[PDB]
Amino acid sequence: EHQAIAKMRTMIEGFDDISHGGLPIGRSTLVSGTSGTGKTLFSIQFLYNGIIEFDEPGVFVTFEETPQDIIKNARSFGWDLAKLVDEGKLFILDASPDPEGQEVVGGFDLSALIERINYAIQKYRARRVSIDSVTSVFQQYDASSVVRRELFRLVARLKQIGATTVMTTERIEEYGPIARYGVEEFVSDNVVILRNVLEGERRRRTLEILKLRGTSHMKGEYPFTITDHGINIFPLGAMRLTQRSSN
């Protein structure tokens, strides 16, 4: 109403503390990171927790992976996505490509695509949406600005339905541009960066909330690991001293 923007809980351990309450409701959050940083995992965990914890239905739009592979790989975290799909609480929308596709001009694919995303959200009454691998849809149209503001048409339309959306995308360097192809220009409201930094010959995973428009959040990088229960962050700064003592 006349209040500051509210947030929806991800229930991703540590993240709701870093974000001071979760992801801003009814807006898009970009999650950008090099290959294998945990973007797709973040975007699945977001939808899964919504279904399991809050009975909020989800739509997962896949541009890179097949739905069969998304479901099979999620078993790694003890998540049965096939059951949720059967129950109608999750819908996986396949926009990944036939190996057999051909030459194109025009970006209208994508108008039809936005309408299918809308229809799915309404059909499943979804409140959470994940869009996986914006980078991939860019590579299919060669970063022509027909994909670029067809992307803005998507971000806009999601905001109109009031969907709360995670969009994942690739970057090439750990400490360099936010997103390959400048994706952060469109998914611009909120930006989360996942890193997999080389410390000598060892890797350290970190998560940073760079920006959340209209609200507060913790700053800088926070280390995390990926476990059999998904992403697990820890809130060094957020800890508080309330604990009791006795003689």
Q: Which residues are annotated as a binding site for ATP?
A: 36-41, 76, 211-213, 215, 217, 227-228
Q: Which of 6, 2, 1 is CA-nearest to residue 164? A: 6
CB atoms within 10 A of CB 79: 21
Angle at 34 between CA 33 and CA 38, to 5 degrees: 65
Whole-angstrom Cα distance, residue 29 to residue 191? 6
57 vs 92 by CB, closer to a second copy: 92
Q: b/e per residue, 220-242, with b = 16+ CB within 10 A?
A: eebebebeeebbbbeeeeeeeee
From the list other proteins, a second copy, none, partner contacted by residue 116 (C-beta under 5 to 8 A by kind): other proteins
Instruction: Look up residue 242 and give its two tokens.
Output: 């309330």
Q: State yes or no: residue 185 binds a second copy (CB under 8 A).
A: yes
Whether 120 contacts 126, CB under 8 Å: yes
Q: State yes or no: residue 23 binds other proteins (CB under 8 A).
A: no
Query: What is the DSSP code (8-state) at residue 245?
Result: -
- Check if 64 is active-site: yes
Q: State yes or no: residue 151 binds other proteins (CB under 8 A).
A: no
Q: Which of residues 119-158 bind a second copy (CB under 8 A)?
A: 139, 149, 152-153, 156
Instruction: Look up residue 139 and give its two tokens.
Output: 């590579």
From the list 106, 177, 229, 238, which residue makes contact with a second copy (rule: CB under 8 A)? 177
Whole-angstrom Cα distance, residue 105 to residue 1? 43
Mask: binding to other proteins, 38-77, rule CB under 8 A, as x and -? Answer: -------------------------x--x-----------
Strands 190-199 and 202-212: antiparallel
Q: Which of 75, 82, 37, 76 is CA-nearest to residue 60? A: 82
Q: State yes or no: residue 114 binds other proteins (CB under 8 A).
A: yes
9 vs 149 by CB, closer to a second copy: 149
162 vs 214 by CB, closer to a second copy: 214
Query: Applying CB under 8 A, which residues contact other proteins?
Result: 63, 66, 93-98, 100-120, 137, 140-142, 144, 146-147
What amino acid positions are annotated as catalytic residues? 64
Query: Applying CB under 8 A, which residues contact a second copy?
Result: 2-5, 35-36, 64, 69, 72-73, 75-76, 99-101, 139, 149, 152-153, 156, 172, 175, 177-178, 184-185, 188, 191, 198, 201-203, 206, 208, 210-211, 213-216, 219-222, 228
